Amino acid sequence: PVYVDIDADSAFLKALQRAYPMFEVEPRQVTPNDHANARAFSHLAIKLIEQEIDPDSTILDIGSAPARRMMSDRKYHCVCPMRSAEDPERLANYARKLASAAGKVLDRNISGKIGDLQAVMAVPDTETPTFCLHTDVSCRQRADVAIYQDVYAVHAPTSLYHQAIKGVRLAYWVGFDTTPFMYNAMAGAYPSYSTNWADEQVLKAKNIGLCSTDLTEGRRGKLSIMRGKKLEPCDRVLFSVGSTLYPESRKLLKSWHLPSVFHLKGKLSTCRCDTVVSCEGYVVKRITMSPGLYGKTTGYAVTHHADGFLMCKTTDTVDGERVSFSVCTYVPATICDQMTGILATEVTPEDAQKLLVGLNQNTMKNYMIPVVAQAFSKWAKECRKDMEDEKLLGVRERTLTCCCLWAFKKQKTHTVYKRPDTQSIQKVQAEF
Amino acid sequence: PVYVDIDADSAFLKALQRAYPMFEVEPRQVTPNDHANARAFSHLAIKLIEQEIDPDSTILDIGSAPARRMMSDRKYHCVCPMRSAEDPERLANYARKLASAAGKVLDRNISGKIGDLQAVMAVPDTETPTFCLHTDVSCRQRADVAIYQDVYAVHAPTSLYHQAIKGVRLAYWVGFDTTPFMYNAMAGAYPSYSTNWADEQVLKAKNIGLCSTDLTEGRRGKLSIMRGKKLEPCDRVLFSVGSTLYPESRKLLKSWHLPSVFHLKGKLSTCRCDTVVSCEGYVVKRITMSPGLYGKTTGYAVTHHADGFLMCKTTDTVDGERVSFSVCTYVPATICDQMTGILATEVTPEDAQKLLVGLNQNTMKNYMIPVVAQAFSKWAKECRKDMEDEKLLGVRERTLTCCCLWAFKKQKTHTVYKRPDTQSIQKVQAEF
Amino acid sequence: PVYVDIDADSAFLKALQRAYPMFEVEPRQVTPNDHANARAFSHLAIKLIEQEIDPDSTILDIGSAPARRMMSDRKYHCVCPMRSAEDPERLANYARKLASAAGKVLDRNISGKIGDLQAVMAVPDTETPTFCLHTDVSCRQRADVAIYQDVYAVHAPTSLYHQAIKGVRLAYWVGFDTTPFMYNAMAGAYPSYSTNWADEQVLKAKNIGLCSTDLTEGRRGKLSIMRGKKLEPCDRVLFSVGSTLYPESRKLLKSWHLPSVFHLKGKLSTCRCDTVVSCEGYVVKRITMSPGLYGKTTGYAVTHHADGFLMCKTTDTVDGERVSFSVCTYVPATICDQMTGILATEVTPEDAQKLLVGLNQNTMKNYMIPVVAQAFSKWAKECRKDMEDEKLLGVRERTLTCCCLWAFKKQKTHTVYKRPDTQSIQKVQAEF
Ligand SMILES: C[S@@+](CC[C@H](N)C(=O)[O-])C[C@H]1O[C@@H](n2cnc3c(N)ncnc32)[C@H](O)[C@@H]1O
Ligand SMILES: C[S@@+](CC[C@H](N)C(=O)[O-])C[C@H]1O[C@@H](n2cnc3c(N)ncnc32)[C@H](O)[C@@H]1O
Ligand SMILES: C[S@@+](CC[C@H](N)C(=O)[O-])C[C@H]1O[C@@H](n2cnc3c(N)ncnc32)[C@H](O)[C@@H]1O
Ligand SMILES: [Zn+2]
Ligand SMILES: [Zn+2]
Ligand SMILES: [Zn+2]
């Protein structure tokens, strides 16, 4: 009987129950959290991890908040490298809770957790069995299972290797789906979790999920020192999960988009990465490690789309300058199935938006209805073009460019639309 | 009373109950598996195999996961050649299970399986009665029945001969239907199992089940070193069963499309291959083995279509380059029977898609709906052409090409549509 | 109380009950057999044969599987020539079953059947009372009744004479209706049994029951060594009953289309052939023997059509080459009676197909609806021409071709449509 701090009549509830069929999910709202869905998913993911693994095993959780691991009889190595700015306050709250139940609870090893804390504030390199202050690439504990809950700011292969050489055979990564970042989107949204994200180059946009601009009359533009001439995604992006900000990096996010099979080649030598939980943009990936190189890797990563996924071209204004960039999002499967019949023809963005609103009135958040409509209007258009320019079966028409090279014409692809029950396949680096 | 890890209200349930009338299939969902239908079908296939064969017989299963064979009183030779990269993790889980029930269960010969495991990790050539680490062409155990559960990456005649010389009289192959690869399709889908497969040449496509492309403006194409000038399916294909990747080969897949009667001719010398279970793209084939050469072989293989099967030409964009290739899929029999009345005429693909959507709103997955529409729109067109160009009865009009040869005009065949209650007959190699 | 391994709600059930009024047919599905109707008909045919004949008589069954004849107190001479490739496997299964009830059942003479088996695998010419390994024209057993269940690959007069000189007075042939093959059809279908059959020259066709072709762009045809110039049925045909292949010969199949009265003239010298069971393409014919020559023969064979029978010209593509050939099938009597009103006029194949589908939506299989429509569209057309070109009563207009010969004009006959309650009369050879 798992309890979730969400509304008793929230639409996400059902989806959550579909994501965790082995648990009886019951709502109990005690906080008007702006991102309660994320916390509920994280709670059920942790409960699933505890259920699925060995009860007698030390559990190290990378970059974790020690306050959340309370009331858990399982041994936890709450790794707190003290790197981020939020960590001192998390430790303060954890110490407050640890000092508030000295003679209240005894089965949760709190009596030894007090000693562990007193030890770690004596010598900075104090590797207590249950708590330490080091990064994941420097901790010396030798446990069996690793946990990365909402940990995106770290290189996945390096950390996985560092725990693999540390005896960790199982790793769990609970976090946002990394498929949008393998598509190189300038901005995107997880509407089911009230989450938005955007590259720093479009944080001053107008009509995206995470942006803020100013009223202007259409004056002369900035005498920019840099010409620009190109708007391409940069490494630094901003995540707004409710009203909370996280600065993330595209390289580190893509590092966690591990293929199904990959190799770890360092001092010690195959590994697997499978998506065991996937709900409306939040995923739980079960990585498992095994010493010795066995088999061979294709370097291919697969994402299965229960709901529709879109990455489309859209025109906005950044600081008042009209530009076009890519925006990604998720659309519920019911909406995608109801849109199949209409999308057989060329539909204008306005009619598509009106039909989408009619199907909504809310299954999907209205704030991203327009762009999706445009996406569909592009998709149904492009497919129609593929109807008109029917090529011969198995013939490529390439022109010899007066040299030893061959060139072809690339069509206009404005929308990438992964329908429900489809899969995105992306070539990724293996054999780290 | 067989229990299936599927939803309690899933549409596939009924089809599953229609595939195993001997059993009482009851749903019990404990995992949100992206490919639960595949595992349910495999489970019932194993149960059917166990019911239909001799209880007193050592049962060797080729390339099997030893964890699934637990709680089975029948003797199992779990052959684990340690070739793929997922196998060490399977052995780790199997050893965990074998060490977690030492004093718990005693009727499953686990006490002896522990000794077998400790034997196999002592000498690499330890052929224990219940476990060994060798390929199917090198193991020396002499049992009576062979099982190939989801084993596609092996040569069927070679493995069948190697087990026939080992005394194996019965072989079972549970896996995806191999008819699409005898048709040489570039890509295909088993929608009832959320499965999408594609040739490596078209993994960067736009609107197929297994693909992922990027947004482009229509720039100059790649200055390719190879001219191309032909798009034909290659040996390497990728399977996505839910969110799991499998690199398969066309030759080994076609090797398992055995004819009804074929001969094994080596050191020792008829064989039969029949499809005993067939459900919406997943088949269980019962190969029966017999020493000596008896009768004669036609070299013909037969596939019966309970549901409609389609392999049609479709135009997509691979890496932004517009090409045309073949895509195959299955369509429910109810849909095919409802489409029969209108397909007497020429119907545009848009009208076909709208009629398909009206008949769907879901019997079939919507992401396959458009292309099937195209297929039907092509098929109904081509049939109409055969109506217009009525030839004479038993006359072939071939022109003498000013030589001792004869030539004829080939018509445009863009769609192969095997309706329900039809059969595909393909000439394959016999007498290996 | 006969039990049939068919669905409890199958539409064939009623027809089966109409074909065996003396039995109580009850469904009991224990296998998802692709050709369960054929096996149910064979079971009831065998049981009807057993009921209708002398309980105290040795019953030799030609080319039979010995596993089927189990649980039958009647003495059986299961003749197994070992000619086909399926015989080692059926005998292996039979030995398994005989060895699995050595202390279970004792009223089925199994204790003596074990001795008979041990005898036949000692000397190859061991003619045991109940089992032997010889062809029907070499076995020396002298019994009273012969049974040919699904035995098409043998010459009817030769085998019938060979068992007539062996004292067999009664013979039963349970198999497929041979009327389509006396009409010399290139392809055909028994839809009620999911059965198709095609000549080897049209196995690469496009839109028939048993065919499989490939997508082509309409390129240059094969530089054939043979000119062709004629497409006529050949001796070798392929039968697909569900998903099982049988290579049959037209000569041996037509051999069993025996007339009502025929003579056997050899060393010993009338015989009768009557169709005692007929159901939707499956026939049980009762042949009765009498020594000596009595009466005289007309050489005429009669087939009574309870349901409509069609053989019509249709245009398809064999290996992409557009040709026209004959296709035969059966149509339910209700459909034919509903077809009578509108066939008084000329009806386009499209309208005929639409009205046929309206009458169907399934009484008849949809996959053969179009061609039948074409057939009807031709038939109602040709009849109309006979109405327009009204000749005189008893006058034959024939031109003297400047010689002692006379010639007439032959009309275009594209469809033969034997309506229900009609008979096909064919002149066949007698006095073998
Ligand atoms: C989201 S915050 C902590 C919340 C945590 N994900 C949870 O749900 O319990 C991410 C944390 O990762 C830690 N971190 C930063 N860099 C790290 C690294 N290189 N290795 C391990 N942890 C790190 C930071 O201290 C930061 O507090
Ligand atoms: C799908 S995985 C195992 C799962 C298995 N099909 C099951 O359901 O239990 C296929 C396995 O076949 C094994 N294999 C690969 N090549 C083989 C070969 N040549 N002979 C026998 N097994 C092989 C690999 O070790 C791989 O783990
Ligand atoms: C349809 S299969 C047997 C199944 C059998 N009719 C039944 O329903 O039980 C055809 C069989 O005819 C047998 N056969 C082939 N040639 C024969 C011959 N010349 N005389 C008698 N039987 C023959 C073969 O052994 C083969 O098994
Ligand atoms: Zn530590
Ligand atoms: Zn072995
Ligand atoms: Zn005999």
Starting from the CA of residue B134, give the closest ligand: 5
**Euclidean distance between CA atoms B63 and B90, whole angstroms:** 11
Ion ligand 5 — residues with CB < 5 Å: B 132, 139, 141
Kindly identify which residue of chain C lies nearest to residue B262, measuring between CA atoms.
C85
AA identity, residue A90? R
**Euclidean distance between CA atoms B235 and C255, whole angstroms:** 48
Of A371, A369, A216, A190, give the one whose Cα is nearest residue A283.
A190
Decide: A250 and A234 in contact? Cβ < 8 Å.
yes
**Helix axes of C110-120 and C87-99: crossing angle, nearest 10 degrees:** 140
Residues 6+ apart with CB under 8 A from B25: B2, B4, B13, B16, B17, B44
Decide: B51 and C30 in contact? Cβ < 8 Å.
no
Starting from the CA of residue A128, give the closest ligand: 4
What resolution in angstroms, rounded to 1 decimal? 2.8
Taken as a whole, chain C contains a residue count of 432
As a dihedral over the C-alpha atoms of residue B124, residue B127, residue B130, residue B136, rounded to 10 degrees, the angle is 90
**Euclidean distance between CA atoms A241 and A175, whole angstroms:** 12
Residue B305 among known ligand-binding residues: no
Residues 6+ apart with CB under 8 A from C158: C137, C432
Please name the helix (run of DSSP H) or strand (run of DSSP E) that holds residue A47, with its range, or none: helix A36-52
Q: Does B410 touch chain A (CB under 8 A)?
A: no
Q: Does B392 touch chain A (CB under 8 A)?
A: no
Q: Pull the structure tokens for residue B30.
A: 């404990």
Q: What are phi and psi of A344, to 5 degrees?
A: -75, -20
**Chain C positions in Cβ-Cβ contact with residue A393 (cut-off 8 Å):** 215-217
**Chain A positions in Cβ-Cβ contact with residue C216 (cut-off 8 Å):** 393
Please work out whether the CB of residue B246 comes within 6 Å of at least one atom of ligand 2. Answer: no
**CA distance, residue B371 to nearest chain A CA (Å):** 11
Q: Pull the structure tokens for residue B221.
A: 């194409």
3-class SS at C416? Answer: strand
Of C296, C292, C306, C291, give the one whose Cα is nearest residue C260.
C296
Angle at B45 between CA B44 and CA B51, to 5 degrees: 85
User: Helix (H) and strand (E) counts for chain B?
Assistant: 10, 21
**Chain B positions in Cβ-Cβ contact with residue C195 (cut-off 8 Å):** none
Which H, E and C letters describe C17-79, residue by residue? HHHCCCCCEEECCCCCCCCHHHHHHHHHHHHHHHHHCCCCCCEEECCCCCCCCCCCCCCEEEE
Decide: A372 and A310 in contact? Cβ < 8 Å.
yes
Decide: B168 and B272 in contact? Cβ < 8 Å.
no
Please work out whether the CB of residue C149 comes within 6 Å of at least one atom of ligand 3. Answer: yes
Decide: B420 and B336 in contact? Cβ < 8 Å.
yes
**CA distance, residue B308 to nearest chain C CA (Å):** 10
Note whether B303 contacts C243, CB cutoff 8 Å.
yes
Decide: A363 and A332 in contact? Cβ < 8 Å.
yes
Of C72, C73, C77, give the one whose Cα is nearest residue C58.
C77
Please work out whether the CB of residue B87 comes within 6 Å of at least one atom of ligand 2. Answer: yes
**Euclidean distance between CA atoms C76 and C141, whole angstroms:** 11
Starting from the CA of residue B168, give the closest ligand: 5
Residues facing B323 on adjacent strands: B316
Q: Is B263 a catalytic residue?
A: no
Decide: C63 and C151 in contact? Cβ < 8 Å.
yes
Please work out whether the CB of residue B149 comes within 6 Å of at least one atom of ligand 2. Answer: yes
Q: Which protein residues are within 6 Å of ligand 1, measured from CB?
A: A 62-65, 68, 81, 83-84, 86-87, 135-136, 149-151, 153-154
Q: Closest residue (by CA) to atom 6 of ligand 3?
A: C150
Taking residue A71's Cβ as centre, other Cβ atoms within 10 Å add up to 9
Q: What are phi and psi of A321, to 5 degrees?
A: -95, 125
Of B420, B368, B386, B406, give the one whose Cα is nearest residue B187.
B368
**Euclidean distance between CA atoms A293 and B83, whole angstroms:** 10
Q: How far apart are the CA of C4 and the centre of ligand 6, in A?
A: 30
Q: Does C429 touch chain A (CB under 8 A)?
A: no
Decide: C54 and C40 in contact? Cβ < 8 Å.
no
**Euclidean distance between CA atoms C288 and C146, whole angstroms:** 10
**Euclidean distance between CA atoms B432 and B263, whole angstroms:** 6
**Euclidean distance between CA atoms A409 and B219, whole angstroms:** 7
How far is CA A148 from each of CA A16, A138, A174, C431, rounded to the nearest angstrom?
20, 16, 6, 90
Decide: B315 and C217 in contact? Cβ < 8 Å.
no
Q: What is the DSSP letter of A175?
A: E
Residues 115-144 of C with CB under 8 A from B: none
Q: Does A30 touch chain C (CB under 8 A)?
A: no
Note whether B322 contacts A423, CB cutoff 8 Å.
no
**Euclidean distance between CA atoms B194 and B37, whole angstroms:** 8
AA identity, residue B45? A
Please name the helix (run of DSSP H) or strand (run of DSSP E) that holds residue A378, with its range, or none: helix A369-388
Residues 239-258 of B with CB under 8 A from C: none
Decide: A318 and A201 in contact? Cβ < 8 Å.
yes
How many angstroms separate the first and last alpha carbons of chain C? 41
Kindly identify which residue of chain B lies nearest to residue C230, measuring between CA atoms.
B395
Q: How far apart are the CA of B132 and the centre of ligand 5, in A?
A: 5
Dihedral over Cα of A174, A180, A184, A187: its sign: negative
**Chain C positions in Cβ-Cβ contact with residue B393 (cut-off 8 Å):** 313, 324-326, 414
**Euclidean distance between CA atoms B157 and B264, whole angstroms:** 7
Decide: B241 and B35 in contact? Cβ < 8 Å.
yes
Decide: C40 and C4 in contact? Cβ < 8 Å.
yes
Q: How far apart are the CA of B117 and the centre of ligand 5, in A?
A: 13
Please work out whether the CB of residue C158 comes within 6 Å of at least one atom of ligand 3. Answer: no
